[PDB]
Write an enzyme that holds these catalytic residues in place. Structure first.
Site, short mmCIF file in Angstrom:
data_model
loop_
_atom_site.label_atom_id
_atom_site.label_comp_id
_atom_site.label_asym_id
_atom_site.label_seq_id
_atom_site.Cartn_x
_atom_site.Cartn_y
_atom_site.Cartn_z
CD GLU A 1 -2.26 20.40 34.34
OE1 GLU A 1 -3.37 19.69 34.42
OE2 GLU A 1 -2.33 21.54 34.78
CD1 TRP B 1 -0.52 30.21 30.72
CD2 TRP B 1 -2.17 31.79 30.35
NE1 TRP B 1 -0.29 31.43 31.40
CE2 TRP B 1 -1.08 32.27 31.06
CE3 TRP B 1 -3.16 32.47 29.93
CZ2 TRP B 1 -1.22 33.70 31.37
CZ3 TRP B 1 -3.26 33.68 30.29
CH2 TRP B 1 -2.46 34.46 31.13
#
Ligand code: HEM
Ligand code: HEM
Ligand SMILES: Cc1cc(N)nc(C[C@@H]2CNC[C@@H]2OCCN[C@H](C)Cc2cccc(F)c2)c1
Ligand SMILES: Cc1cc(N)nc(C[C@@H]2CNC[C@@H]2OCCN[C@H](C)Cc2cccc(F)c2)c1
Ligand SMILES: C[C@H](O)[C@H](O)[C@H]1CNc2nc(N)[nH]c(=O)c2N1
Ligand SMILES: C[C@H](O)[C@H](O)[C@H]1CNc2nc(N)[nH]c(=O)c2N1
Ligand SMILES: [Zn+2]
Lengths: 407, 411
Positions: free
Chosen positions: A283, A278
């Site tokens: 990001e 996950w």
């Protein structure tokens, strides 16, 4: 030969001995450090197999036992006769978990032992690959309550019959160059989006079009498959304070699933091994949204915030950066899709490093990748010295197959 | 051989040949990278080659390689070494050497400025009092009423290692730290040990949150002596915020002149153990590190409290939010008072242009990514996306151990 790493915030010093087990080369020399560079036979195979099986038998507290010696003989015989060997299910699971444990660029390794391994070594066709990957996507997604998974397709043989997923991640958005000269969608995926069209895909031709899978079985030409949209969990992005944020029209997908790496276990090479965990929020919010060569949204957001964009020293980019990242986290959280913030993830990694130092004699870590792309020094990893070295089992980067394949 | 570096944002690729002139070791090997480790008397025998290599580089830079002046200087130095076991640098060679130690400093993002450096030759200094006077003059010159000028002051080189000149302060200007009996710290926790030494040496501590430390100066290997920099020479900036009127009442200030005093300058094999140098700040050093490190002033909580941020969960990004506001305040404050400062966007963008220029004119630019990338907003600066090669060139600046650990007290 025994090496110390110091945390400069806490003064805690750890001693690394695990590096001495390292085998492969870093790219650095005594004269030059390449720390910031992104990409720095039967005779060969048996030492690799033996090294792996020794560590495996050691791990189950059966080192130097008759079952250990017998499996080493069995594998030796099989390599000698067949030029390769097959891993036991127990060995494959162990190998996959350790490849993750050894991934020096991964901040999320506290989780390394909770990994669901899907054994797809019986797969023979791209349709079969598609099926396995849909099942992975659905299992891992788990209606937003994400679960780490890897699916492992058959190992390399002569190298002319490689299994590959052509996508770099199972789920990404298309990118299109326009007559305008601009890029619509994700600029990172322009080349791949074109290859998809050139193979028959009919692009919706929007900003957020989920790409088809391009699957290569047994070294054959790859084939297109659309993932059932109901299996692709996406998140509309909104802000807890800013009403207008939703108007930007931003979304992302919940499942980060890397599909372009090579898993090496006991000298065997798995060229198709998609895995997923996950997201850490940065990001998406920092890199996917704010890299100049990606969705590059800083300017748009800064304008809606009515910031002074005339000078860099007003820190308008930095303010907008934080707000974008607040939105990403809020949106996933509200929609109950697992995400981790960079504070929480790096704190966990420090705890993981300490566990690894005490239980294993070290933890290979690449500081350049581990420190988040925002707010570096307000995370504990910034202050933590890390030694980087390569252990096997490993995940390795491999070149895009379109450069290699012959149609 | 050629080594390539790539910028992943621009796809600009550069080619390094300069790394072939590197002799000194990195700490790394084929099996291990120590890229994030902070710390990874010579014989005549080692000395003449070091001298020769330096003099060859100096003479090439002036386009006089192989000249009679070059050859005569080699012979002169050689004879000086064999007779006295060391040698003296010409003023020209000293200036060149100090400029190049800066040019070679792989952790320095400000190197576009390297060729503009005022060098103060203090090799005729003999006492701590004389050191104090040289340092006062450096501070005044460098400060220039807020229009900061880069400068370095170079004291006599090492002889037997028993007669070292040393500045005991890690920077010329820093604030005192005091551990309280309840375990809390007043002032800068990074300076507690040094403050204790100063107090032991006779400094009367005001015991406040921003007390400028006295200088502790060692000449010719003698016990160090305390001096107070005249306060009129110490330029300081009260920190306020453009929109937040309560920010001033946190009572923060910082000094304008960042002046590193604890490093060793190596030129042509000679060792200058006291070589204080100064430029101007990049904002994040103060706003990110000095103010927000947990082990330093640690102001994040109080700032976020006053901003009424949701502090019950890290995922509100309250720390990140307060961090940007604090760094806005530092830049605003310096700018408003006309004290030179550079933001991390401008400094990194300038560094990339410097680096490309260095590749073109010099064949490379050793750079330590771990240090070059700013401690906030990393990937929204161009250096994050820039591959770098780290290697060691001389002349150089090196870390040295704190002198209180090594000093032989004469009493
Ligand atoms: C469970 C939650 C996880 C989190 C929060 C996480 C976090 C991350 C992050 C932030 C990165 C850097 C990615 C980038 O900047 O491109 C990364 C890299 C990586 N991780 Fe993880 N990770 C997770 C799970 C996994 C799993 C399940 C595996 C494999 C089984 C894995 C293996 C890797 C590898 C090989 C890299 C380097 C990828 C590359 O070189 O592009 N991680 N991880
Ligand atoms: C002119 C403006 C300058 C700016 C904006 C600047 C910027 C910086 C910054 C941000 C760092 C990292 C500092 C830290 O994180 O502790 C640094 C390191 C360094 N700089 Fe500069 N610099 C400047 C001038 C100078 C000068 C004049 C010299 C010497 C002549 C110098 C030599 C060094 C060295 C040796 C380091 C590494 C220090 C260490 O290892 O502690 N820089 N620079
Ligand atoms: C040249 C190059 C080398 C390399 N080793 N990796 C890359 C890929 C580059 C490196 N960072 C940007 C791009 O990866 C994006 C993939 N990131 C995934 C989503 C990470 C991830 C996160 C959470 C869980 C996971 F399982 C995986 C590129
Ligand atoms: C263990 C260790 C090793 C090392 N090489 N340096 C240090 C010093 C550590 C490294 N970051 C925090 C502490 O430096 C404070 C000095 N920073 C100055 C102000 C840099 C500077 C900036 C602008 C102009 C200048 F001339 C100098 C510590
Ligand atoms: C050149 C430099 O190595 C490159 O930009 C790196 C820096 N650190 C990174 N860190 C992570 N986690 N992911 C990345 O893609 C990068 N890119
Ligand atoms: C452990 C790590 O190397 C250390 O914290 C470094 C990281 N990068 C840095 N970068 C700069 N500019 N200054 C520093 O003090 C540090 N500290
Ligand atoms: Zn290295």
């Amino acid at each position: 030969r025994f090496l110390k790493v110091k945390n400069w915030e806490t003064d805690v010093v750890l001693t690394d001995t695990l590096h001495l087990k390292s085998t492969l080369e870093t790219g650095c020399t005594e004269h030059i450090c390449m720390g910031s560079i992104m990409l720095p036979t039967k005779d060969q195979l048996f030492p690799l197999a033996k090294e792996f099986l020794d560590q495996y038998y050691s791990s189950i507290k059966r080192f130097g036992s008759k079952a250990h010696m017998d499996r080493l003989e069995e594998v030796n015989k099989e390599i000698e006769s067949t030029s390769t060997y097959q891993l036991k299910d127990t060995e494959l699971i162990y190998g996959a978990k350790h490849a993750w444990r050894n991934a020096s660029r991964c901040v999320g390794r506290i989780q390394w032992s909770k990994l669901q391994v899907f054994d797809a070594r019986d797969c023979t066709t791209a349709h079969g690959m598609f099926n396995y990957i849909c099942n992975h996507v659905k299992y891992a997604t788990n209606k937003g309550n994400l679960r780490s998974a890897i699916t492992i397709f058959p190992q390399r043989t002569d190298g002319k019959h490689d299994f590959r997923v052509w996508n770099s991640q199972l789920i990404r958005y298309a990118g299109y160059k326009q007559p305008d000269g601009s890029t619509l969608g994700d600029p990172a995926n322009v080349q791949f989006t074109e290859i998809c069209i050139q193979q028959g895909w009919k692009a919706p031709r929007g900003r957020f079009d989920v790409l088809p899978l391009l699957l290569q079985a047994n070294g054959n030409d790859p084939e297109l498959f659309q993932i059932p949209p109901e299996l692709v969990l996406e998140v509309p992005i909104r802000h807890p304070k800013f009403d207008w944020f939703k108007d930007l029209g931003l979304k992302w997908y919940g499942l980060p699933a890397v599909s372009n790496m090579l898993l090496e276990i006991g000298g065997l090479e798995f060229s198709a091994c998609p895995f997923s965990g996950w997201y850490m929020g940065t990001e998406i919010g920092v890199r996917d949204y704010c890299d100049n060569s990606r969705y590059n949204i800083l300017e748009e957001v800064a304008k809606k915030m009515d910031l002074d964009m005339r000078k860099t020293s007003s820190l308008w980019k930095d303010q907008a950066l934080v707000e974008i990242n607040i939105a990403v986290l809020y949106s996933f959280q509200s929609d109950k899709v697992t995400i981790v913030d960079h504070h929480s993830a790096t704190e966990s990694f420090i705890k993981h490093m300490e566990n690894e130092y005490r239980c294993r004699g070290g933890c290979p870590a690449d500081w350049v990748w581990i420190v988040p792309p925002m707010s570096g020094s307000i995370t504990p990893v910034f202050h933590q010295e890390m030694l980087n070295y390569r252990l096997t089992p490993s995940f390795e980067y491999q070149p895009d197959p379109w450069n290699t394949h012959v149609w």
